[PDB]
Homo-oligomer: A and B are copies of this chain.
């Protein structure tokens, strides 16, 4: 969800039913304008909110002009003051393999491995996993230059109605056609394609990481995505599929 079109995106009307209050909405317009000011980002997308147990973890990401770098994501508790999260790696994301469940409130909560595991590093590494596995990009929004710098397509139309239902018309928003298609998915059928308001909306609801919502209309220019959910991976998915 883009910062300049947060009110111009059907969040509560997307069908997931996990949106924002007017308090959180006005806080996101003012605070995402603030993190567009002091952090020199080309464009800032509201990533989503993690529900937590005692407090909500509002997550937003910012991007440079290269458009394929790892995201300098940001977090907030009262949805007003935002600060940068440390960059993530594989060895640091390995560390929470012995713990599971929801995570609550302040980043200073220590988890038992006994190595004390911080809440903040678990949060940003989980953000990296949800970015890597799910939160797809639409087709035609990312065109390729001969150099390594990728630009967002200003001439993006970019999905016909015959290609809305197909899996192959969505790529993973991850540096790796351009990117890995959604038919390279395990298990087969881990995305719920659903028709709301006729042809005026489609949702690609992720089932490996619920409740991630991918935001159309066709003929547009949004081209957005939002994850609001419990925060942990759905390892239960092939049983229910």
**Chain A: residues with CB nearer than 8 A to chain B?**
3-5, 7-8, 10, 13, 29, 33, 154-155, 157, 197-198, 200, 217, 219-222
Contacts and interface: CB of A to CB of B under 8 A. Distances in A.
**Most B C-beta atoms less than 10 A away, residue of A4, A13, A197, A217:** A4
Oligomeric state, in copies: 2
A7 B4 contact: no
12 contacts: A4-B217, A4-B220, A5-B217, A5-B220, A7-B13, A8-B8, A8-B217, A29-B197, A29-B198, A33-B198, A154-B157, A220-B221
Judged by DSSP, the binding face of A is loop
Contacts of A10: 7-8
Contacts of A198: 29, 33
Nearest to A26: B197
A4 B200 CA distance: 7
Contacts of A221: 220-221
Nearest to A154: B157
A222 B33 CA distance: 20
A10 to B, nearest CB: 6
